[PDB]
């Protein structure tokens, strides 16, 4: 056929391009960290805690990683990283032996479809599985040395879903309040703030169904404990203010993009600014006051978009990931700024930066606390990269 | 000197960047205006606050201005066809492609047809009117991409709107042609009801020299560098498969280029795929496990300044492909586990020693069998210390009990025990003890 | 018993060729097809009547420099497509499908140039590869696994040259520069257990690498026959044929005339010679002879461009035969001969990238 020949060609081209980008990096970033895992991951979460040992030049951070192996035993993992915390220090930068190390392994039944730590307790995390339920765990209650037998204490799994999903969000203000979203076209809500009789069985307190398509994502409010929206392939965003008691008719519902919506995120520093992400290769945004206005559109991704995340430490900085093996960085201030024809042929102004590391569909990324401008990225090629852009770009 | 050598060699690197030129021009790898030495680009600064709770009001008013107007049916007659039969007119509706959809969806719905004359002419008329309702709907502003108009008898097509929902069709008498599968045509009305030089070295066996036209634009990627500095940088980094040198001819610039010598460009992936039997390599369709590695490249930059005078990264883990010691085949990441393909007993040795024993003529089978049965067990454990020999003969019969019995050869075993005591390694306190444990 | 030059061709690169192989897997009636490999190219032709030969296909390797050495025609049990594999100095083995005009399999496990490839007469997934690494390997071209490695403490010491299956496919002979000729067996229980195993292995199934078989001992050998190199051997029913640079081909049997072939003790230390064959000007090595699928005639190339032909019939090797078919164009050398499934045509390669053709008139 043709597609085979064509793909061989495309592969060789991508290889060349990565060669070039690597040769060119030194003038581009303030940090380059690459590390290969045995099995890839599908998760990313920076632990909100940081320790910095004295007499040295580096910090220490802990990361929350998942695992989707081929066939063998699945695991939940959290490992260690030694970020340089210094400006004058530079074997490589610090010790010679190692800068990354695994520390936490837990047996897991099925792959990991999602994993987030609870905001109130980082020792509490959730887990989406190939099954139709939810698992919760507290690592401090299990040894890092994994059970050579296999499956172990599910640590209060949940119930109320019928197909798998990917949505996951604790309520920031209210403990125990956690939302879910699966192929069931439904949103299931447990409240584990108080389950003395665990029994590994808790059913979702409330189950919402307003989308008639497979739901894609859900996120709580950032200030309100009784507010959150919804995302399905319906290309319909529905506003779900709880305490109104209707799992059928939400508070609001409009069409966001012409293609199915995938990812969704709210600005922390503001009250109203929403960040939306869809399959439309588009990026839109909205406000809680009025909604019948697609505020703006970022139009440079060349395939679907699967993740959006605002910046901590920065009010006007956002991030767009997808499948194009690229990663974008925008700017809300430079909206329509007259630029030179060469600045324009470079690109539109408001687009701020584009990451050029990975060579596969960028699975997932994350900001972190404890550090101003750094993000880790995970692809499907067993690849983990951490970087810091050069400084000169801003200011 | 078959100059095709000079040709064929420098032929290769060219087309590559050539393709890459176009690709990057549409497939940006990184915004150049971010680059350090391309600092003249990105004329704008990063000086702004731009609170957000006001960004809405600026749009809240702008949308009042942005709403210019809208259009509020149609009717049109077809003047007879002209050529040097009934007609067919359609209303095709196009929607947006979706996730599972590979191509855009199109819906060809007919509003109707009529009976046009058989290629009529002028001065013969004394007439089929086409009237349209609002088939298009405002709800379609989320699902349909566009609407067009089709005409057949023999094909013709027109579209109704613009991407801005802007109608493209005013009212009036229009003359149009059409194609089948000057000439045939139809009329109708409408109604809404420093010179720079180069030198190409070939190991001094020959060369070629040229001159840059429209200089300070990349001779490959047409990148507009405004300085010899930035241009030299972009060249010695991006189009790296060559090598360069700065000559500074008095006329403003001269660069004698040469081919790179090593340019270590080889696949950088799972180093194993290189040898997968073809068709499976680059499968890219299933997770695969491999050994862990970690590199560091950018740790702490210098951030110096420009200096034309100047113009004239470690590992952690296994970074290669290991092989089997005896067959020179690849080594799966799992096979490289505790299996160490080495121990004290090589098969071929056991064979060789027995055979060599059988060369001897002046021996009885009641002796050769014994010697072999023993020497093999000797090899099997590697006994060295003399304090072991007692335990040795013990374990020996402890294993070969059934056999020597089945061999009925214990009597020569005892003769051997004799010999060994004679060589001062057995005490009498065990020789018997053997025959005891034997039964 | 009369062939005539009805055609002769020549390449353009002018670099000597070595290989000639009719496809002896022709469903009865299908046209005659044969191939030939040169410096770094392969060639596909078809025999036509009136001394006509038609170019069909040709491939080439550019990415390195190699001097291809051998070829062999086989098929696919799955869909019956013709199959050709070749190998050169680089020591790699490739497998090409003309139906798709692509290579589907490549094998790299040797350490030097390869010298010959043959298949088991019965099984079509068993490829024997002889190299200069003193090691004769043997692959399952279907499950992509090695099987045996003949050579070691008692192997050949210098650059194995040529080998040949027995007529039935359970016994092999080998010959190399060290004047040495050794016998291997395949019928042993261990061996066939190994083979059956080979036909069963899933890499995804186990964390284990397949386990080959190492053999460190010939069944029998000697170096008493020639006092020079030996570079081509042929099973003869249960008799042997071999040539040297001593300008004579010899036939013999191991042990004594009474000694059966399948009772031979490994420590056998005697051989029985029967007769000799004679020719002129074969004063260089690496020159081969072939025989008809019906084992009735003998062909042999020559240094000065001549030919020499015998009959494998009751013709007593004392005065068996003498037949020299000659032409006046090239006398550079002739490497290799080849017959069809029948005895219709006979091709041979001259040293100057020129082909020849001889059509028989019985
Ligand atoms: Mg391949």
Swiss-Prot record, chain A:
The modification Phosphoserine is found at residues 95, 340. Changing residue 262 to A: Decreased interaction with ZNF827. The modification N6-acetyllysine is found at residues 1, 145. Residues 1-117 are annotated as: Interaction with ARMC12. One of its GO terms (molecular function) is RNA polymerase II cis-regulatory region sequence-specific DNA binding. Changing residue 164 to A: Loss of interaction with ZNF827 and loss of localization to telomeres. It holds the Pfam family CAF1C_H4-bd. Changing residue 166 to A: Loss of interaction with ZNF827 and loss of localization to telomeres. It is found in: Nucleus; Chromosome, Telomere. Signal peptide: none annotated. There is a cross-link at residues 1, 145 (Glycyl lysine isopeptide (Lys-Gly) (interchain with G-Cter in SUMO2)). One of its GO terms (biological process) is nucleosome assembly. WD repeats lie at residues 29-110, 111-160, 161-208, 210-255, 256-299, 300-356, 357-389. Expressed in neuroblastoma cells. GO terms for cellular component: ATPase complex; CAF-1 complex; chromatin; chromosome, telomeric region; cytosol; ESC/E(Z) complex; histone deacetylase complex; nucleoplasm. Its main location: nucleus. There is a cross-link at residue 1 (Glycyl lysine isopeptide (Lys-Gly) (interchain with G-Cter in ubiquitin)). Keywords: Acetylation, Cell cycle, Chaperone, Chromatin regulator, Chromosome, DNA damage, DNA repair, DNA replication, Isopeptide bond, Nucleus, Phosphoprotein, Repeat, Repressor, Telomere, Transcription, Transcription regulation, Ubl conjugation, WD repeat. Belongs to the WD repeat RBAP46/RBAP48/MSI1 family. Core histone-binding subunit that may target chromatin assembly factors, chromatin remodeling factors and histone deacetylases to their histone substrates in a manner that is regulated by nucleosomal DNA. Component of the chromatin assembly factor 1 (CAF-1) complex, which is required for chromatin assembly following DNA replication and DNA repair. Component of the core histone deacetylase (HDAC) complex, which promotes histone deacetylation and consequent transcriptional repression. This is Histone-binding protein RBBP4. It comes from Homo sapiens.
Curated annotation (Swiss-Prot), chain B:
Changing residue 6 to A: Fails to interact with JARID2. Keywords: Chromatin regulator, Chromosomal rearrangement, Disease variant, Intellectual disability, Isopeptide bond, Metal-binding, Nucleus, Phosphoprotein, Proto-oncogene, Repressor, Transcription, Transcription regulation, Ubl conjugation, Zinc, Zinc-finger. It comes from the Eukaryota. A zinc finger (C2H2-type) spans 216-239. It is found in: Nucleus. The modification Phosphoserine is found at residues 309, 340. Belongs to the VEFS (VRN2-EMF2-FIS2-SU(Z)12) family. This is Polycomb protein SUZ12. The gene is SUZ12.
UniProtKB/Swiss-Prot annotation, chain C:
One of its GO terms (cellular component) is nucleoplasm. Keywords: Acetylation, Chromatin regulator, Chromosome, Disease variant, Host-virus interaction, Methylation, Nucleus, Phosphoprotein, Repeat, Repressor, Transcription, Transcription regulation, WD repeat. GO terms for molecular function: chromatin binding; enzyme activator activity; identical protein binding; methylated histone binding; transcription corepressor binding. Coiled coil: none annotated. Residues 2-362 are annotated as: Interaction with EZH2. Residues 70-224, 222-362 are annotated as: Required for interaction with the matrix protein MA of HIV-1. Expressed in brain, colon, heart, kidney, liver, lung, muscle, ovary, peripheral blood leukocytes, pancreas, placenta, prostate, spleen, small intestine, testis, thymus and uterus. Appears to be overexpressed in breast and colon cancer. GO terms for biological process: cellular response to leukemia inhibitory factor; facultative heterochromatin formation; genomic imprinting; heterochromatin formation; negative regulation of DNA-templated transcription; negative regulation of transcription by RNA polymerase II; oligodendrocyte differentiation; regulation of adaxial/abaxial pattern formation. The modification N6,N6,N6-trimethyllysine is found at residues 118, 189, 205. Its main location: nucleus. Changing residue 286 to A: Abolishes binding to H3K27me3. Methylated. Binding to histone H1 'Lys-26' promotes mono-, di-, and trimethylation of internal lysines. Induction: Expression is induced by E2F1, E2F2 and E2F3. It is linked to Cohen-Gibson syndrome: An autosomal dominant overgrowth disorder characterized by accelerated osseous maturation, advanced bone age, skeletal abnormalities including flaring of the metaphyses of the long bones, large hands with long fingers and camptodactyly, scoliosis, cervical spine anomalies, dysmorphic facial features, and variable intellectual disability. Belongs to the WD repeat ESC family. This is Polycomb protein EED. It comes from Homo sapiens (Human). The lineage of its organism: Eukaryota, Metazoa, Chordata, Craniata, Vertebrata.
């Amino acid at each position: 056929k043709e597609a085979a020949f064509d793909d061989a060609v495309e592969e060789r081209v991508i290889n060349e391009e990565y060669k070039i980008w690597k040769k060119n990096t030194p003038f581009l970033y303030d940090l380059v960290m690459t590390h290969a895992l045995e099995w890839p991951s599908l998760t990313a979460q920076w632990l909100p805690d940081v320790t910095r040992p004295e007499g040295k030049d580096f910090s220490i951070h802990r990361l929350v990683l998942g695992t989707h192996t081929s066939d063998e035993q699945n695991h939940l993992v959290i490992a260690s990283v030694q970020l340089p915390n210094d400006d004058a220090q530079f074997g490589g930068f610090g010790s010679v032996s190692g800068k990354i190390e695994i520390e936490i392994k837990i047996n897991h039944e099925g792959e990991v479809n999602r994993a987030r730590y609870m905001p109130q307790n980082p020792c509490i995390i959730a887990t989406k599985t190939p099954s139709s339920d939810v698992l919760v765990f507290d690592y401090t209650k299990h040894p890092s040395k994994p059970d050579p037998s296999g499956e172990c204490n599910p640590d209060l799994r949940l119930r109320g879903h019928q197909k798998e999903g990917y949505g996951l969000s604790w309520n920031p203000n209210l403990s125990g309040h956690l939302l879910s979203a699966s192929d069931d076209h439904t949103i299931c809500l447990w409240d584990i703030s108080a389950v003395p009789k665990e029994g590994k069985v808790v059913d979702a307190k409330t189950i919402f169904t307003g989308h008639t398509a497979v739901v894609e994502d859900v996120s709580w409010h950032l200030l309100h404990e009784s507010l959150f929206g919804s995302v399905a392939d319906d290309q319909k965003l529905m506003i779900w203010d709880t305490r109104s008691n209707n799992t059928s008719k939400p508070s609001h519902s409009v069409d966001a993009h012409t293609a199915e919506v995938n990812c969704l995120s709210f600005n922390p520093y503001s009250e109203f600014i929403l960040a939306t992400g869809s399959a439309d290769k588009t990026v839109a945004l909205w406000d809680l006051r009025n909604l019948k206005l697609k505020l703006h559109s970022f139009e440079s991704h060349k395939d679907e978009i699967f993740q959006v995340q605002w910046s901590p430490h920065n009010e006007t900085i956002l991030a767009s990931s997808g499948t194009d093996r690229r990663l974008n960085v925008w700017d809300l201030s430079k909206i329509g700024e007259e630029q030179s024809p060469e600045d324009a042929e470079d690109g539109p102004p408001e687009l701020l930066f584009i990451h050029g590391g990975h060579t596969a569909k960028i699975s997932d990324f994350s900001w972190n606390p404890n550090e101003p401008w750094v993000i880790c990225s995970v692809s499907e090629d067993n690849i983990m990269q951490v970087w810091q852009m050069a400084e000169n770009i801003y200011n | 000197a078959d100059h095709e050598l000079f040709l064929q060699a420098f032929e290769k690197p060219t087309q590559i960047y050539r393709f890459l030129r176009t690709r990057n021009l549409i497939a940006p790898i990184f915004l150049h205006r971010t680059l350090t030495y391309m600092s003249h680009r990105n004329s704008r600064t990063n000086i702004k606050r731009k609170t957000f709770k006001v960004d809405d009001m600026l749009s809240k008013v702008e949308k009042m201005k942005g709403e210019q107007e809208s259009h509020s049916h149609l009717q049109l007659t077809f003047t007879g066809f002209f050529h040097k039969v009934t007609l067919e007119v359609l209303l095709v509706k196009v929607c947006h492609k979706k996730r599972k959809d590979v191509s855009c969806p199109i819906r060809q719905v007919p509003t109707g047809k009529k009976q046009v004359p058989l290629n009529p002419d002028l001065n013969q008329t004394k007439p089929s009117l086409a009237v349209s309702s609002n088939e298009f709907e405002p709800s379609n502003s989320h699902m349909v991409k566009s609407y067009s108009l089709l005409f057949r008898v023999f094909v013709a097509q027109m579209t109704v709107f613009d991407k801005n929902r802007r109608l493209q069709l005013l009212d009036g008498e229009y003359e149009v042609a059409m194609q089948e599968m000057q000439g045939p045509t139809l009329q109708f009305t409408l109604r809404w009801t420093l010179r720079i030089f180069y030198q190409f070295l070939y190991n001094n066996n020959t060369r070629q020299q040229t001159e840059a036209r429209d200089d300070l634009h990349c001779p490959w990627c047409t990148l507009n560098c405004r300085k010899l500095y930035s241009l030299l940088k972009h060249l010695k980094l991006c189009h790296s498969r060559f090598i360069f040198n700065y000559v500074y001819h008095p006329k403003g610039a001269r660069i004698d280029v040469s081919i790179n010598e090593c340019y270590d460009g080889s696949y950088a992936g799972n180093p194993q795929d290189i040898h997968r039997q073809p068709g499976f390599a680059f499968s890219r369709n299933g997770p695969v496990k491999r050994t862990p590695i970690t590199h560091i490249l950018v740790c702490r930059p210098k951030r110096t300044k420009a200096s034309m005078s100047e113009f004239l990264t470690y590992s952690s883990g296994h970074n290669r492909l290991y092989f089997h010691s005896d067959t020179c085949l690849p080594l799966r990441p799992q096979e490289m586990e505790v299996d160490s393909e080495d121990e004290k007993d090589p098969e071929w040795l056991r064979e060789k020693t027995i055979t060599q024993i059988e060369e001897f003529s002046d021996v009885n089978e009641g002796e050769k069998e014994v010697m072999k049965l023993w020497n093999l067990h000797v090899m099997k454990h590697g006994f060295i210390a003399d304090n072991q020999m007692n335990h040795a003969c013990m374990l020996f019969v402890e294993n070969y009990g059934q056999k020597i019995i089945k061999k009925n050869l214990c009597r020569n075993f005892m003769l051997h025990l004799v010999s060994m005591h004679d060589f001062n390694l057995i005490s009498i306190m065990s020789i018997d003890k053997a025959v005891t444990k034997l039964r | 018993y009369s062939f005539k030059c009805v055609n002769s061709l020549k390449e353009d690169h002018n670099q000597p060729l070595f290989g000639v192989q009719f496809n002896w897997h022709s469903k009865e009636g299908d046209p005659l097809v044969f191939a030939t490999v040169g410096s770094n190219r392969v060639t596909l032709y078809e025999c036509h009547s009136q001394g006509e030969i038609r170019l069909l296909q040709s491939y080439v390797d550019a990415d390195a420099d190699e001097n291809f050495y051998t070829c062999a025609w086989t098929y696919d049990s799955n869909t019956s497509h013709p199959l050709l594999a070749v190998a050169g100095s680089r020591g790699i083995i490739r497998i090409i499908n003309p139906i798709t005009m692509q290579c589907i399999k490549h094998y790299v496990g040797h350490g030097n140039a390869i010298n010959e490839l043959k298949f088991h007469p019965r099984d079509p997934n068993l490829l024997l590869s002889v190299s200069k690494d003193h090691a004769l390997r043997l692959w399952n071209i279907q499950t992509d696994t090695l099987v045996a490695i003949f050579g070691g403490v008692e192997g050949h010491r210098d650059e194995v040259l040529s080998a040949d299956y027995d007529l039935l496919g359970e016994k092999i002979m080998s010959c190399g520069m060290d004047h040495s000729l050794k016998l291997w067996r395949i019928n042993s229980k261990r061996m066939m257990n190994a083979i059956k195993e080979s036909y069963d292995y899933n890499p995804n199934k186990t964390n284990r690498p397949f386990i080959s078989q190492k053999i460190h001992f010939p069944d029998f050998s000697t170096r008493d026959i020639h006092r020079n190199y030996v570079d081509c051997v042929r099973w003869l029913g249960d008799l042997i044929l071999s040539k040297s640079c001593e300008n004579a081909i010899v036939c013999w049997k191991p042990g004594k005339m009474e000694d059966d072939i399948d009772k031979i003790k490994p420590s056998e230390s005697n051989v029985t010679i029967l007769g000799r064959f004679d020719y002129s000007q074969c004063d260089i090595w690496y020159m081969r002879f072939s025989m008809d699928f019906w084992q009735k005639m003998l062909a042999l190339g020559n240094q000065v461009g001549k030919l020499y032909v015998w009959d494998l019939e009751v013709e007593d090797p004392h005065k068996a035969k003498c037949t020299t078919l000659t032409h006046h164009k090239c006398g550079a050398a002739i490497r290799q001969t080849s017959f069809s499934r029948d005895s219709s045509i006979l091709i041979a390669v001259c040293d100057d990238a020129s082909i020849w053709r001889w059509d028989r008139l019985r």
